[PDB]
């Protein structure tokens, strides 16, 4: 079982099959409690909750008095990352027999929506209770589940109310990616490529070379019982864990600014195109625009911009606002240069790359609005 440290503790545990034969046992022995609360959505729970209920019972059977496992299922979608849902979960926890107390260990089984929501619930339940992250999406495995950043959204913005609350454990089971929708897997690759581009030209090269194999496995038709990533586990785990390790490294150390490469323009685009277009899709276009911005300022070589554009496309991500899929889903929406500048103002410090794997500076750089408007043209 591969382990990765974060903030001094060895909380990240990664491998294929953890959910089926490692987590329940580990929670009972390492996160001892009388009460375990599992929060997930109906899409994810319908697939993974049954096996775990059994793994838990078997693991708890030995302990005495045996602990309980309580399950809360939220509707899928970001609509659930709200004040009302947080309050409903808390009320439900307080309605148990007996009510969930300070020893409760909350299990966040899901993507960034469930992870953000669940972590925030854990942070304030009776002023704070332990929780673990069990990321089921690619973006969650390498980004959202690491760092302790929790929150909910309000009608005025994303993640505006929340808290920094570190999970006791982060179980990364790559088998969850076997059922993750193709579009979501691709969406998550935006963060993986971003991380390689700002830290390792060698890792970026590995991604370029593994693109066809991985995407093939993702788009593959699986037989009722076989594993989707059959003979490419080592490759997948390597590429995914490289991004999670970087995120962990950054969180454990201005350097975190680099993690926002592609997000200055990316977030501006998303503010306009969401919810039709996903975060990673917006950031992919953002990485291309920000790479072109650096080239405009003569900081990044054109050859480098081409590699970024092709690597993003090789994983199925859009590289321009003129992308066919984007326009089809955004019928009626348009990202005017002014609308994009307006959004970037509410964020100008953009992360600039001098070479793949090499940032211009160990932080975001200042850019004149004049130059930004030219790359958005
Ligand atoms: N905490 C942070 O620092 C941070 C960083 C980045 C993004 N985010 C947050 O992440 C959220 C987006 O999360 P996301 O992209 O993971 O999407 P998501 O959590 O909305 O999940 C996407 C969809 O996939 C389904 N799904 C998830 N895992 C599955 C699996 N293994 N098999 C089958 N279906 C599965 C879900 O039911 C859902 O419908 C946003 O709300 C954003 O604000 C937070
Ligand atoms: Zn992002």
Swiss-Prot record:
Subcellular location: Cytoplasm
Binding site for NAD(+): 41-43, 78-81, 111-113, 116, 136-137, 158, 176-179, 187
Active site per database record: 267
Residues holding 7-phospho-2-dehydro-3-deoxy-D-arabino-heptonate: 127, 143, 149, 159, 191-194, 247, 256-260, 263, 279
Function: The AROM polypeptide catalyzes 5 consecutive enzymatic reactions in prechorismate polyaromatic amino acid biosynthesis.
Record lineage: Eukaryota, Fungi, Dikarya, Ascomycota, Pezizomycotina
Annotated Zn(2+) binding sites: 191, 263, 279
Domain of life: Eukaryota
Recorded name of the encoding gene: aromA
Species for this entry: Emericella nidulans (strain FGSC A4 / ATCC 38163 / CBS 112.46 / NRRL 194 / M139) (Aspergillus nidulans)
Name of the protein in its database record: Pentafunctional AROM polypeptide
Similarity-based family: In the N-terminal section; belongs to the sugar phosphate cyclases superfamily. Dehydroquinate synthase family.
Location of region: 3-dehydroquinate synthase: 1-369
Subunit structure: Homodimer.
